[model samples]
Target chain A: MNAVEIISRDIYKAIDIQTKILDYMTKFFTDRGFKWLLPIMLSPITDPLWPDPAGEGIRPAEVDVYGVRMRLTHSMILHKQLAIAMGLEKIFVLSPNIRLESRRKDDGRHSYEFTQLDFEIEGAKMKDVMRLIEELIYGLFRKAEEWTGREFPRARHFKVYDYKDILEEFGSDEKASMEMEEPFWIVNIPREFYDREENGVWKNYDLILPYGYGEVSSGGEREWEYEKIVAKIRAAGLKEDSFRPYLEIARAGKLKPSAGAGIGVERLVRFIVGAKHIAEVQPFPRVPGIPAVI
Target chain B: MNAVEIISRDIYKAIDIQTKILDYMTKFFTDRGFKWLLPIMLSPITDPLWPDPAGEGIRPAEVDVYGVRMRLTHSMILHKQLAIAMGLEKIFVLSPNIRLESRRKDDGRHSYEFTQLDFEIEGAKMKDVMRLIEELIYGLFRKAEEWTGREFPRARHFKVYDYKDILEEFGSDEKASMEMEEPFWIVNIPREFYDREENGVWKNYDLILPYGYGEVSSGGEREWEYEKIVAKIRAAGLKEDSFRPYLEIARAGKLKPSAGAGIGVERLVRFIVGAKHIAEVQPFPRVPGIPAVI
Candidate 1:
């Protein structure tokens, strides 16, 4: 059931776009003085996307290695922060992520397995990352225009909004996605303890594509101060035991201040090619669980 | 301990060669008319690297999704063949692989996690795959020479031998590796049941790096005939139920003859950097077991 072939002409087109996305993204980062690092697929420490209201049902898949428990990477957030300490000032990895999500037949925008174009910049602020992404994405659309000789919509401006304000106005991110006609950013989201917080505002952002594409990317400034990170963990009532190894590195004052984000390749490709379901784009779709009904 | 920093001069050099390798490989494959593919991370059917004498200690990591079990990719072998079935003439993926190898304290060439530059050519012969690899690896070294302004020891010659003959003469593959100074091929080596066979000989081959780095690459023609492949699985005493999903597609006689290979990126980088231990080159070392000091 997992290994599906690309049988349709539209599916082939999607593949072309996905590959172009990778080629362009790699060159885009490298052009900006970024070094590409290979992603670690299995590790003990990974992003704890916990206590986030948006991530209620998602969980990290657990695997055993040599009788020891290891977690499949949810995102390489911790690794990106560590690479900065390794003295690589700017780094990018087209890293993969796995979330234990149950199959929701009604939803057309979920996949349990996907790749993230994750990048981190040393000593950069939130706005710096936002600017770089805007540049990169606009260029992507320009090329897509060239490929089909058709003009895309919009004047290429990404509207930004605060998470709390957007939620209050639109009721939900999904509801907001329905009303948009251009890609936009939702910042100051209260999610993930690792994202930096200042003056009661979380220095984080999620980019949602217009026309019901949901979230295509999530990233922002990372919290590197050891005590502040622990304080947030305690404040959220999250167990620090899962992050012990990362804490040790932070305890040694090895981590550096950085800003980064991960753009989901599937979600981006789905939006580009206009696939009805996210799983349709994947050659071998890692779909979510088998629901009891519906 | 897993989050390592690139704090040394040679480490910087290794990272440079690695990024260059990725860039060159992507270019090489694309220029050769190969469409790059995004890799599948989890599935029910994977390369059962089982019952092969060379892979006794290696096992695929299994993860649970919604209470059902799935296997992480050992190699994207099945997916490659299926891609060919999708009418893709040529495809390649820089796939991540996870194998559960216990921490062997003495070994320098082992990792619990690594990446493989896996590629497949539709309706191609074994020699075709071999020649393409030879071209790729030589081109890799050729660039390294320019980067350092020094002569590489290889004259671009890769000696080939039959598996049984090499085993008889050298006692073990490792022994031959100890004696050689250039990468060489050992063909007709019995491996995974999926490799094509002719006249009681496996059409598969393994490319072993010289100087005891062991096998850096493995490939050959693939078995496309459903019944024959099933016979091999039964011959190896492997459970066919594990491969039911794949067999369903094969049963329809949809698969075509394909030739491909997967090169371990870490081993290649180690060879390029002359690292004494494979772990040394990796920025974040995913070392094997604790060894109860190691």
Candidate 2:
């Protein structure tokens, strides 16, 4: 709440570790031929995050700038798709997200304001993104270990499971997470309109952290056709007019086959530093209900 | 306006150069012993920009997160001071800012949203920052030239002038900017609640770009004592409660003497790339009176 809290030794280490991680992750992506685009902060159409339980306590942050009613970015998902459609081929951005996560004020895994290392590929699949996430995490934890002079938990190879299998095995994602030893993947989440679907199974995946740290990153194959997007939007009960500009692009056949994910920067930092709460990693932490005096 | 606009060879080159500048600047500061802190995007208190002629059409962007009213950062001067006072010694952040800059849409200089490479030093004088800025500009230009393989205009030496003398001679800052061969400095602007003052003259400075690019950066020593801050806030006709938290720190003698400034990233990029409008650097192009399709 005061200057003393943030200037503490622990917080300083966390901030430094965060800097190192971003620097390395950036180089990793660029070396692999990803064009690093500056993140879009505000837009007329951002992610609706419909039907996802992670959006349970969230509300849209509407802002009026330049006489246009816009919303602050909850995720750079839409813009990433647009960039891919623009023939960028491969791109990434360290984007900031604001979700007024109301009911999860004290939850260790939630933050109302955070950064996501978002990336996308023009003709990639869910499997391509999953492998990329694994390789990126290996380097991240190795760097964290080097700086801290201590080992954190991780697996030699990450495992993947279906959403239905996880629910049947442990009853809930939270309970299943408590029994894990390292970061792993869960697929087929019934999420928003953009994620592709086939044979009654949504083709989306969430990378959950070990020791109950919850979902750290999300990625999937995106639906590019106009009709597929329209059907998904209708199924989710979302307004068609709200996404008119995006729909127009799709209808014009500009939207391309793409896959991407927004890996939560603060969440990764928290796991690396083993912080008690998500707020511990952020300097002026915008947690669910803990108003910081900044 | 469409995918075609952003995917052009020219804009792609501009975005690439912007990335290189930020990467080099971050390394430049860290190597010079400045701790790189992640930026604060929203807070209860932000720069009022009161009494500054440059702030003529600006309005406060208030956001309510977690039941508390906060404003997006117009500048990170206040938080930089707090961080320095807490004994970080020196710090910097490439922070985002949103100002509803009305009446300046087509001026080739204004942006409704922009990023600033803001920095501060504890117990430092104005001359120290001035020299640092000069060195930074030299390195920035050198790197930009290396990538572009073309020499842009620059002065062998950047000149300096008093704000009063320039205004008296040229009648306005805009008029004076037309006569510059390269970047230069202007000191002693009559504005703002936090810039230091001595003997009835404000000890502030602005770094203006040549060829009518306007101000690229602004900074000065800050008034750390409680009485001085109170007097300045009142003199600027701003409410005391609006700055109650900051005022409390000052009154408690925790505020330390510091000097800092935010160098506008888009403005600098516009100058580097020789772009016609400041919005040319930003992908989304949030400019006043020109509502973007995004």
Candidate 3:
């Protein structure tokens, strides 16, 4: 079936499965004494999508967000991971933002823009978060079969790659190119991935996914070292004043050592559900003409 | 407990609840005969939260995403409402995403950024969507009460306003402000709201929410009028070429008539959770300092 046909026929079933997943998540947190409040809507525009902006400038695209037309960056996916790692908490995010970089790099698995589920866990250890992700994925796959009465064929032997090694082997830029292909994290110490001359700064994560979907989630072991954090920001060419409050938090030692991941929910949905185009998943499919889908 | 303490404790709870919610949703859809699949993460950084070539536009004081910092608006939610509406089959979408709008005007309820849970259903009427929203809210409230073993107070009742009335009442410049303070749709939209400044253009809605948080959801009966759709674009001052694909879809008469709504998930969640401030619920709270938490 075509993408539309496939999704249209089983929309409710998809929603039910999705609802169950979220319900489980809600219950899990509430049972653990966490307030299970729903999150807010976000604009991928004006948000950072990469470890470093100005590192490599992106071609502007008319973003169709809830009918609001604006030029958007793909770094929104990257921001999800960074925001959480910096000790930010109480967030659940996802998007279907596309990147010009991936398109330029000829990623076979993903188009310039793709859907992604960017989920991040705050105050959670990497191992634990990873465990949760695995469980979530497993649960989703199993539930899909239950709903469709057929196994999802794209299931693979999930591979979790270390952030450091990928960067080392692929080089930050190339590694970034690969990350656009599939899911992978650029964990460990901050690495530079920006196009200094073309843009201005370098990105931290060297996480590269082999699927050529580009980097879905870029994160690292959050830095508790305040000075190191400041230095990193400075190195990225940001002013100290700009990050003053963030630095204070770090200086005050308010941050906890944690690792989280931001998976683009839309992108995940696209890949898993076998959507050929990112617009296929959108209600209005904000093509150029229908920028706002109104 | 303080924000950090509260979030730290709540992180586990939130995660747990989130998982449960997901599970419930999965089961709900599966029972309805929808197939599900978990796609891989892949998208561009459409927001400032990432390390984009350009830095994040705004930074907040505290971001507690996990427990350390709250990073809100972490996901990008997507769904093809029209595809489902067309009866192409396979419909239903609920996505969590991070969102930020140009808080050009700041009432207590509006924040620069936040989180949200966005869901769309195919083959469902507008009334059905509204009912679902009502049921979801009620269920969530009940769930919260069940967890706390206490009743949460509901806000005062308010009227739903329409855009045409607001524009007719207040001019475009202050129309937004009026809508912000008093619930009303600011129809006869000004050229600023859209990239395409099509004159004599206005978006109508069933009604606007009345309260501190206004315009909670922006929706309307889908504009099925092809000429009107194109006129809206031109009136908004958008180039026709930019929306070629979109226009093609609309012109083909293939585009289904589908009403859609966008609710500030963060706003809704904050209200239901009874959190005084939105920052409390976000994993990465953006105010000042703390540029890019973690």
Candidate 4:
């Protein structure tokens, strides 16, 4: 079957599986008292987590909302942190994001618009976030056969490695993940947002699946100290004014320490359904460079 | 509590209810064999929905994806018809849309970004669509108390009237809905794209809720006949080339007769939760003219 046909036939089944997965995930977290934050699809500013491939100053799709320049969400990372600051201990969003990717770098896996189920816990340690992901995956794996009437790929004890260690051995994070035979975690990467020491080691983790699926989730404990974040922003060469809203919140000393991860819905669905490409799992696939017919 | 506090405290509960509602909705239709179509978030073309207050044309939030001009989805009406043509007997989407409203007309209820639960059924009549909505609402009302521990509004026997009759009596659809004490239906609307006879009476329905909360759902049998749609496009003074993708499909003579509806999710949630304003129910509201904090 073509991508469209595969999607049409599997769409209901995919939704059935996804609904059950989300149900279990929600209950698992909410039972432990996590609040659900609805997704915000647009904003004046958002996460600059990933850099644009074209290197065109992190290009995000812009919308002129009543002449007030707005941006389609790239990620809800900042909002998740803010939700924690707003006195919510645990929060999650089924966030929809738009990334204006370079057409020249387009692949079957990339889409301009995608959904991410992101969650963060205030005052949580890295271990806490790790435990949450482990349990949620375990729950999904346990329920998959019963839910979809098809055996899902098993996730064994995930191998864990420090980012520096992995880099030393495999030369890159992508290489480490690509070489894996099962889902594994690579930790302590030097990301701008993640908490870091003066020595330049940052605290983070990337969960990568086997069969060359690459990274599925990446997150870590964040820099909650306002002064530290400002320094980090300055060091990264981003304008302090561009992040005025977030900076103001930070300066007010309201933001709490938190950690969270964003799992790509299409990639997760693709893995569960044993699809060869991410586009196959999506209903209206917006593969980069292809102006697909709806 | 203020709106923010109420939202914060009730967010989990609200999500619990929403999750259950979506679960029930998905099952209700999928059990009857409806195919699930994921939302198409961005496109080059979308519905020329109701004009903005400024009347500067029906402009959707525009996006520049890698130099390719795109419009954020305003509605999936065209996609629903296309799904049926693609051989799906029935389909639905939890569609997210972005409509930039005029700043001058900003209201607490209106947002630049919103979601719609839209669905279509192949070879179905208007009655079929109406019955589906009724049964879905009845099911929701039946489970509301159990699901959320709160009473939900309901529609028992909807009062139906022609669009002209409603206009003649109440001056407008909004006024008619506001005047009603319960949910009511207005049919035979003269919307341009709906299938119309030589005399211009269109087959359509607008389901409006009480308490001045206007339309919750609007849909009807579409202009599926290729020639008719072409003529309709021309009659509406739209360039035929603008809808090249859709026109090509229609020209293939594959579109099946279908009926469907697009129901506003926030409006429904507001009614269920008894919120005085639509903003109260949204997590990260994008009310026009207001640059809300993340």
- Candidate 3, B157-271: lDDT as tens digits: 2234344455466543243444353333333323221111234443323223333444455433345446866775676455565334345555656555554444565554554
Which residue pairs collide in model 1, if any? A86-B5, A86-B6, A103-A289, B103-B289
User: Residue by residue across B128-237, what tens digits does model 2's lDDT show?
Assistant: 88888888888888778898887755554578889888989988788888987788889988788789998888778899888888889899988988998899888777
Candidate-wise lDDT, in order: 0.80, 0.80, 0.41, 0.69
Q: A142-193 in candidate 4: lDDT tens per residue?
A: 7877766776557645778987788799986657756777788888766654
Pick out the ten consecutive residues of candidate 4 chain A with the lowest summed lDDT: A49-58
Clashing residue pairs, candidate 2? none
Docking class of 3: incorrect
Q: TM-score per candidate, in order?
A: 0.94, 0.94, 0.55, 0.87
TM-score of the first chain in candidate 1 relative to the native first chain = 0.93
- Candidate 2 lDDT tens digits, A1-294: 664455443467776777777778877887797876766667778898787865672557877776678888888888888877766788888787877766554678787778888999988989888888888888778877889998976565589899989999998788878899888899998888889888888778899998988889998999999998998888877889778778888887888998988898888888888887887877676767766777
TM-score of chain B of 2: 0.94
Off by over 4 Å in 3: A1-92, A95-98, A102-104, A111-126, A137-220, A231-245, A264-294, B1-105, B112-134, B137-141, B144-215, B228-244, B273-294
Q: Against the hidden true structure, what lDDT does model 3 obtain?
A: 0.41
The share of true interface contacts that also appear in candidate 1 amounts to 0.33
- Of candidate 2 chain B, the 10-residue stretch with the lowest lDDT total is B1-10
Ranking by lDDT: 2, 1, 4, 3
Give the distance in Å from residue A79's predicted Cα in candidate 2 to where it truly belongs: 1.0
